[PDB]
RNA sequence: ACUGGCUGGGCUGGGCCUUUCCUUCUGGAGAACCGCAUGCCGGUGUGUCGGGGAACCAGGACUUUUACUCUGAACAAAUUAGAUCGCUUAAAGAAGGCCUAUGCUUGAAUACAUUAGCAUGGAAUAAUAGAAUAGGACG
RNA sequence: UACCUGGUUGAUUCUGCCAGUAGUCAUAUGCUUGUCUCAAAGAUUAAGCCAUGCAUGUCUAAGUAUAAGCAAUUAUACAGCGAAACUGCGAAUGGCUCAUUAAAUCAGUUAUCGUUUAUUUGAUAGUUACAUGGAUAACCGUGGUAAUUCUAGAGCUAAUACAUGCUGAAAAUCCCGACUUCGGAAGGGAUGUAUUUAUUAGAUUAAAAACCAAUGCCCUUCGGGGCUUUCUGGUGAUUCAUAAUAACUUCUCGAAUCGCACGGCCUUGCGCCGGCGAUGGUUCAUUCAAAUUUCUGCCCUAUCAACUUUCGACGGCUGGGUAUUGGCCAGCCGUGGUGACAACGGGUAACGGAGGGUUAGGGCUCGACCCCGGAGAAGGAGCCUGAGAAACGGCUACUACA
RNA sequence: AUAAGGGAAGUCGGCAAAAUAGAUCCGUAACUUCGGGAAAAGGAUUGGCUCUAAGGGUUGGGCACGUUGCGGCGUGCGGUUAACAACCAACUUAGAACUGGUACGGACAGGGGGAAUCUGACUGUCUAAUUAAAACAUAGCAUU
């Protein structure tokens, strides 16, 4: 099958080289596996030595950490937006390592709403809509929740903006052709700027 | 070539062996063990071709199956059981106990050793490092693994094994001054006193030895093995490795000849 | 060297494991600790430039703020090319002896290696490169000093 | 065959003064030359005594760069040269020997390869570098 | 043993070749042939074609026994030896040959901080239970085809085959907090290991202060004088060894297995405890290794002088794939790389080396062949099982023979 | 205008008819007056639809004074935006996915080719109404 041998290429001085031995069984290749975001879908495979690999074919979720405050959730992928390497990879729907998707931000609000006592990327103010308030269940809870809120700071409006859509940016750091799990991190300062000013101009 | 060998040609065999030429075509080819291939002592090849208590190959394997002989306290049930540098044996029946170190001449060689003297070891340290759970830890020359070791003892030195509870009980700096015995080389089987050592950085230092006649020798440093700092530990063999020369030999080996006859 | 821009390529470049967006700010004068630039020391009596320590390129190959470890021979040439981009070619000369007439004769070899951003090198001028594992197809070493010129 | 001597004549080597002699700091243990009092037949262990570190060991910094030669390390068994033992001699082999032993004892050496690579001493011969628009050395 | 003689002329001295002389672990052939020690042998021309036979199987006290098996008669679950058959392991080692191959194989010398590793050796893993569920072989019996180590449908029964599955401990750490007197607290959850991502620790190695913010405290005459301070391994060199926090997974492992001994306690219950082995099992170390990799070194030829990038030729970046590095492969972007110190191409009656023959010294020539490394099983490609194969006394397809 | 199987066996003679044909990318011999032969010979691609990338123009640039109905000039300087922002405008070239009764220069338009002999060097001209050629002319050479 496919080889990823050095003996059929050219040497530096340009000579052709000669016939040296048949195909081992090392130095082999395999067929690549193109992720598609839908249904989770995963084969196995037996790799040298008796390990196994994990081939994702389909996949729809996986976990994402936020940097600065600490937490990491599992959540759903929207599509994919950016890709540096090929477009044809950003038309497609597929994904692989260091491409830019867009994530569900609800579980991350959240944790948000509980651990400080703020609300968080509230712009439905004018249609309130949904507004609800439930009664808080202690008093200690406001020492508590004030000293976090005034000692660790606020988000910057960079971030802030895209809570109200719901919408987050994030780039996969995983191999799913290799791991069979799309894992990553979301993207902010000074990197989001990169990104953003490349994503629509 | 697709796969491990399973064969050992004769005329390919280790030379400190002493192996005829003649009668037959292959060698004991000694099984994977604690010791490296080129340079260990096969148990058969102690029993037949040293000591001449089984004649031949067939009758070699008999004894073991009864368990008769030891090694480090276990019995070992593989004619081709690769020993070592420093490993004792023991046959109980016989009532007699062996040490296998080198004479000057490069070569296994038989040592009677006392009852006393069969309970315990020495070896060189190979790597101290923090093992899973932070638990500390060290492996020896012969794979031994110790855990919860002296935080003194660092790598190079040698360590006194208890060798029926594999606990250290004292050990021995690898500094000038000491008593070492070289265990590879040219200078096989030597014995010398550390003068002074030479560090390259990128590896391969080497070491001065001297010798007890004023002669003086080096080696690189992964062929030292101290063993004392004065008055050594172990038994020394007859000779205590001086290293004679060719003339000095032929001498002395008329002047015996005619003492006794 | 002179390079225009540092971020001037599809993606985004960053030293990897370096995190450099953190709310609370801390002064550390540990290299890769507190969120700032990351180096290491060679050894072998080689000391780190100070165009390394203080530059802003982002290069994971080269020798010093990189991922790659030296351990091999070193050794010594002239550079004959510096054509390609971060890449150099070193010419290096020695005697053949041929016994049955008693005498030598001249030869010669070609090498490549991998020229790092912290060094200015120009045609001419003599270098000590040390070896690495495989970069590309036919570059194996990377450079460490350039000596002085006359 | 042993021993001493020659103001013995030679060969190889190590110390000082001649304008030259030999980098440097830290630590280790500790001598020589010195007195201190205590004791024998003008020398000495004296002691956690001190003026004191010849040499040595470990660690750091400094030193124009190649060729050449000397000594080491590392590197395969067989083969070539070569030591030992009357297989009835020999080509071979690695064996054997001692009174008599219900035992003792020994051998299986050494040199060579030779190109390339790693250390050490030497500093003749053959190349190379340095202060001239001082961009020079020192405190 | 550092050696020479015959031949041009009527006769002479030279250059110069022809012939003579000796060896060969170097093959053939002719004549002849009593004994002792040792024993090479279808390599050269055809890596051309093959009838017939053999060359790879394996059981201990210890995986599974209802043989209409034998043998005894201490075993009413079994109990001695034990065909057959399931299961486990090996068959990837040996043995043969020299077709291809001119920086390729190979030699001496380095690296793996760039990876996989059956087996051996030494350590090492607290989260119905007095014992869980369905099949199948051997066997009985009924059949098909001229034909093979081809196989059909019907009826029984096992596992160390296959598939499930049980906090027996505490402490400590981190979150939510029912409930106030605002200064801490009822009680609630998580916390072995493997897998994947993000974050934190992993210290230095000369010393003296004086300020702001504000709190463990000792003593105390209440004016306060104040404040000594606990760990941290390794390399020439790392993001190393190791540890902590937030989560994740068609997701692991942490013993429903077997043999010998016949023991000790009292609440005498078909109760509790207890020894030595066999076979397995997660991680680290070791051994036999394997794959890549640094430096230098190969015969003749110029009537072979310029070569490489159609459709990677040299380098940069993001990924894919692999046990891992790498223009090994996919996109985007630069214009490079070797050469008179002989590149590129053509020849080889060419596998490389240790080494053989012949000798003053210097050399010339041979090496298919008992040792080491590489390649192949009529010519090409593809693949399954497995720790390990691009295997041919393993499979699939084409071409040529049969 | 079209024809099964054969494909010049017809005839003084392949006379008439058929076959090739646009554009883009590969490939190309003997011979030679070194300019040619050459479109040598011989191969591949071609619709519809939804997308991506590349090739341009114009106007704006910091202070410090004086004139003027938020500013046009007079200047005195400094700086070279590690090239940003707004607006405007036609076509030409390259690449990917999907789709069909495998079709796509869909009509029109549109070269058959190769190995040789005889003869005139070439372009050019003539028997209007049966002969366009090897005939005439030509540059070059020589003579009076």
Known sequence: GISRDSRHKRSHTGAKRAFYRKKRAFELGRQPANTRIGPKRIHIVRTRGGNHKYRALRLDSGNFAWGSEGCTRKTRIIGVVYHPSNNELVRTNTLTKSAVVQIDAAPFRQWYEAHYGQPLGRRRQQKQGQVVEEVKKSKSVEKKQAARFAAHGKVDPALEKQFEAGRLYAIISSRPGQSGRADGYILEGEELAFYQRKLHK | ?261 | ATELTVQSERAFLKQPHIFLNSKVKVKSTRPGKGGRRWYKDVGLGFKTPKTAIEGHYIDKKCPFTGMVSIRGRILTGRVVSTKMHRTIIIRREYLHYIPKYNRYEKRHKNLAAHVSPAFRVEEGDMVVVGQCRPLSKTVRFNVLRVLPRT
């Open chain 2, 1 to 261: 070539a697709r796969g491990p060998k399973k064969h050992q040609k004769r005329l390919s065999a280790p030379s400190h062996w002493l192996l005829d030429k003649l009668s037959g075509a292959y060698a004991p080819r000694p099984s994977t063990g604690p010791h490296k291939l080129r340079d260990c002592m096969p148990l058969i090849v102690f029993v037949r071709n040293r000591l001449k208590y089984a004649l031949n190959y067939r009758e070699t394997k008999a004894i073991m199956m009864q368990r008769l002989v030891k090694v480090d306290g276990k019995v070992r049930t593989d004619i081709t059981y690769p020993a070592g540098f420093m490993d004792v044996i023991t046959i109980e029946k016989t009532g007699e106990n062996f040490r296998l170190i080198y004479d000057t001449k490069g070569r296994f060689t038989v040592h009677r050793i006392t009852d006393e003297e069969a309970k315990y070891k020495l070896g060189k340290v190979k790597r101290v490092q923090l093992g899973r759970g932070g638990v500390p830890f060290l492996v020896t020359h012969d794979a031994r693994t110790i855990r919860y070791p002296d935080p003194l003892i660092k790598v190079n030195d040698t360590v006194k094994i208890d060798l029926e509870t594999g606990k250290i009980t004292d050990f021995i700096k690898f500094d000038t001054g000491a008593l070492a015995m070289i265990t590879g080389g040219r200078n096989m089987g030597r014995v010398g006193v550390i003068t002074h050592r030479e560090r390259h950085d990128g590896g391969f230092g080497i070491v001065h030895l001297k010798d007890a006649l004023d002669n003086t020798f080096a080696t690189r440093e992964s062929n030292v093995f101290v063993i004392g700092s004065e008055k050594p530990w172990i038994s020394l063999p007859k000779g205590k490795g001086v290293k004679l020369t060719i003339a000095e030999e032929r001498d002395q080996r008329r002047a015996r000849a005619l003492a006794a006859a």
